[PDB]
Amino acid sequence: QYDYSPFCERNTLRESRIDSFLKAERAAHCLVFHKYRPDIDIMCSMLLESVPGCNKEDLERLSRRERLDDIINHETNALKSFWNDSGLVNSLQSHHLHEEYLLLQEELKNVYKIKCESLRDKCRRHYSN
Amino acid sequence: DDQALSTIIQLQDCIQQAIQQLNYSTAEFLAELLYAECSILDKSSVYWSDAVYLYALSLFLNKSYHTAFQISKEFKEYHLGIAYIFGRCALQLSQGVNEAILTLLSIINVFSMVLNSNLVHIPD
Amino acid sequence: MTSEQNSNRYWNSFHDEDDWNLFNGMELESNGVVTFAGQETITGSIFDRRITQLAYARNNGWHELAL
């Protein structure tokens, strides 16, 4: 019988939640496992396997301690890294990529400035706070 | 049981290694894990006192003085280093200093339970 | 108008203190949604036992923000 003790320390769970967890858990695993019961089984050269935003090429660069079609390749590659290998970009229309790209560095540039006084005046900020 | 003692010794060696370098969060995690593991062992065992002292020292080093003070206060009498950590925490916070005097006076007067150990930062 | 309020008060005298407090400003709308007045508001649908108990709670119960 399906084991549900760890999902709630209370030893009894109402049958509505038992199917609710079982249906939800299997779908969640099936998403990760495939791009069945959970109690039956839980299982399944640079040491580094993955870094968010890092493609196989970036990882290869790390080992070394480092026209319309071409820009479209740069169009997709930019959103590959930022969106962590999202599958919806291939379904997106080509002209909708342009405005998303233009807003990208514009927001990214705004971060760049953010990431980068008289004696009498600068004392007030400490006292008033 | 044959390998149970080996794991505790390995954890102790790893915690001293981590504390020797300026790596404190790793020392924090190792001390927490060792302190949790030593719970099954009886209070009479030297391993429990050693783990409690190591955990208290790691808590003191990570600026979390309140938790270190409480942990040392739970078993201040058992070990000398625990008394050291409790006294230092009392100096940093000015709370419960009287217990620190009544413990430290007894520990120093007797010297001139567990008193001597090979761990790091054991007081002279 | 004055006589009806008088008769209303006369029949209203048969309450307990807490029960009177709950019904002090009580208004019931036609669709069954219920409005409770705190002497906050407890607007909830009626025929469910839980809402009334909740109304009793913040009536006689103690709530303290404590900074």
Add this chain to the structure above:
Amino acid sequence: LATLNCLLGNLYMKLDHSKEGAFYHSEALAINPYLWESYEAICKMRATVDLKRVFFDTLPEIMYNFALILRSSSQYNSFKAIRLFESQIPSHIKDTMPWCLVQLGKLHFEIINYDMSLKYFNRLKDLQPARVKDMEIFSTLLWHLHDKVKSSNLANGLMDTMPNKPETWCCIGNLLSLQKDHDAAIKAFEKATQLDPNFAYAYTLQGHEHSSNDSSDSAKTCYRKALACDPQHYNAYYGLGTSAMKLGQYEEALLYFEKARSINPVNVVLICCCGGSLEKLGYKEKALQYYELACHLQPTSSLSKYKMGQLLYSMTRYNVALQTFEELVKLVPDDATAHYLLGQTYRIVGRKKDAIKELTVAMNLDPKGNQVIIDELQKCH
């Protein structure tokens, strides 16, 4: 030659780029497996290693299990971590060790299960009254529970013990936001982030309070500051996306929502928001795909089923729409506009007997819009 790599990773993570820092943390881990600080730095991002080779090529098994738990939590797959807690990590470690309790409470709180997180890291609070690290999770849980007394207990205790840690002022601001006040919560959050910068959670709550204050630009600035402090934070991305729908500009709204779901794949709110952004963009076929995952990912969620039903009724998959609405009503009967769709689907399929009762329920739920409901009854027969 193990701590130097950790330092290099730390400087890289802090300054510009996380990829090189993660690589150097992995190299340090290669030198020595017992560098838990490196693992926390790795798990701050959504990065993982081949643990079998790292930890092998029963203490190593315990470390391996803990690394799997932390990796799953960072990857936001809580069910697996709960299962490893069930099988491995015996009780006499699991309950006493405060960090395992912290992680388990965060896992349960990630799921809609709310009460059990409260129990778990309430026992945490009992074990370590002076614990200050990772209490913003407790604050968010108390805000979600709409409970004021335990929030007051948290705030009073933390203010009494440690007047200056940023989490304490964050909790003060959260209680103030909960009660009635928004400007007071904003003031508490600036104090929290002035005393300790780089605390992205403070900026996220600042942006949320600014959004609730109908101040778009301030919320956007706070969220951008949060992203500057932490490159990966789905809460601030969700806030920016919500602001963009309010501003009507759906492009950056989908952008922000998409960025947020990437680091938190399992969350019905983010999935439904991304689907709504797609629907505003008009991708009917792709929007249903996310909604299909959301409904199966977590049942007993009103918003996901409601979006499913609206989308299927929009493009006339009535056969599945009717069952989605029926189970929606089964899991909640108080939805007003839902019963309207129940009735519409029932009358479209052609079962008048159920349609009359369902529209009667709808008339009960909405006194104001009854005339339109009466009109639907007229079209029913």
Add this chain to the structure above:
Amino acid sequence: AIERLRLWRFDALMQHMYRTAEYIADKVYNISNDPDDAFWLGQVYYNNNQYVRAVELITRNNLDGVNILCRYLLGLSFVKLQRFDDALDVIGEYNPFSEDGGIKMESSLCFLRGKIYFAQNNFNKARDAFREAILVDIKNFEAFEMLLSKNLLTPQEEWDLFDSLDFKEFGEDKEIMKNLYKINLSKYINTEDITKSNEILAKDYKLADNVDVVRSKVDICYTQCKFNECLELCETVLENDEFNTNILPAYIGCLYELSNKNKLFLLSHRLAETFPKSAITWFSVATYYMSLDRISEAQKYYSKSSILDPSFAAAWLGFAHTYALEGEQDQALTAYSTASRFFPGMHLPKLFLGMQFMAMNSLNLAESYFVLAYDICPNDPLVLNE
């Protein structure tokens, strides 16, 4: 030995000696870890309105599930504490046992489950739960009377259920128990059979003028509008018990039909000094205002009666009458829709809603609600006339 303490504890509990019962129950449960003694302690906690203590007692040792009775006690304590989710948790969504001289243990669990379903307004599952409870053990009667009083079954379905169940368990008392149950069945169907059954029960046995037989006579006269007999039988029964809540609704309706203003004032005043909390008193006061043509003011008092007791058809139906009688027709529709949805299984709300749509001069919807009411109740002059 321990048996003397056990019998003394049971007697102390039975004699309303709560403190002695609690102390001795605690002592006996500490001496021996027998779950029945824990049940006795939980019962003692239950009698003096101390539910949470019993809940923590039965949950602390996790002794529930070892024996069914303590599971039932914990579930009943939860349903009193309104924590219905945990009660449904400990009891279960459906029957777990589905394949002594007392009512079978499992049937009571089904009754509690049906009550839980009724509280969550899940009437469809509550009907099945109550039906299963009555079918499993005929010794139970609480489920049957709850189903008949709250009208979860149509009269034809109620008669089919009564015919389906047998009386083999009773044995010698088969005919008397059959008549006793048949007294309480719904009217509008073959009332001559109920008349013959109660006449047989009257003379042959000493139960000639008991409470339920005169209550059935009152219900019969009220259904057939024999209002004179309403007053004689009701007065002859109220002269013994002045506060019998089983008959008061019918008594109030019969007097309201007779418009006995003075008698109604006396009853309303009498119930005001004794039962202010119960909704019957405020319903009586409200209908006193109703008889004097004070619809607008009686509106509030129907609201109060409705609030003080849910699942009461009289209060909400009268409240809808206050809406429909004088103006403000728009929201009488919503009131009657609430009556129909929240009180399924009665033809009367459907009939009222259809007639009100007819009052609007909107036809098809009125016919639809009328056929719905006819479906619920086949034998009623009102619905057929409408």
Add this chain to the structure above:
Amino acid sequence: AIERLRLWRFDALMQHMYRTAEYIADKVYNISNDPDDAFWLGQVYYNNNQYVRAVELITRNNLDGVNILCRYLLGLSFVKLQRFDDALDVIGEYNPFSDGGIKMESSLCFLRGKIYFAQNNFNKARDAFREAILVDIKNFEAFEMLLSKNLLTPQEEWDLFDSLDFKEFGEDKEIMKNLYKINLSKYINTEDITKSNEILAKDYKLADNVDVVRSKVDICYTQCKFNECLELCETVLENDEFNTNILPAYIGCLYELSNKNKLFLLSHRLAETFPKSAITWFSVATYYMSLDRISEAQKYYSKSSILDPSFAAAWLGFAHTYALEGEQDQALTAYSTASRFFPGMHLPKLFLGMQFMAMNSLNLAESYFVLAYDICPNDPLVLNE
């Protein structure tokens, strides 16, 4: 034939289906027509929170003169219906008579004692409770209610405990005597209480019992061992957090240690658990006193005092709120009133003497301090004062 129906009625009472219990009781009573059946139906009405049905049904055919328990049920229904003179008229002011179960006479005498306690004529209540406990020892209420409200000085309580006999218990008296000996007052003959505590701890595995824990907590409270109070009561409260016997000692010990978070949590949970109990409002007032907010404690001690007349803690806290507020004239009457409702309890008199100290009136304080010290030879407050 009737026996099966009687078992059915008993099962209906056991499983708490009150409508069927009333139905079957009425049917069986109409069949048999005997007073015990009327008693059964009246008890059903009592349990169904319908006392009026029970009293009229019992009094309709004047059954109180037939059996001895039906009159008791009618009297108790009158008791909880807030009628006393007619209840005592039915039962009778004096004693009319002056196997398992308990003798019915002790139950009637206890009911008369409860009436007398409600009527404030305290000496008659003491007489009634003493008569009930001496006539029968199984009636533990006749002992616990008497000791609970401090109706008598502990010396005569010990004297009466010695006087009463445990012989008729027989084989179980060996444990029953010790259990009864546990519950008397702790100020005098303390060492025997401890010895009995260890006696219970050995050979009867009753060390886990809640009442043994209550006895030890009160023992530690008498010597002001507040830390031991907190530890043991926290151990017992984790199992059960709402034991009204346990809670007053825990609140007192919390206020002595002066910690506000634990008191706040417990008080706010008890407020939402038992809204109509005086203990929770007393706890709220204590929390405010730990927070030094005298103004709110005024009202929240007044509420607790009004809710329970036999709650001496409320009077002492109320007079304390006056005293700490700034005015003492009303606190004088408050402490005097507390002393008069509970003769034989030294502590209200001691607090009143301290108020005399605050008002520089030492002449009465000498006698008052002497009377308080007569029964408290070793405690910090008396000697300090």
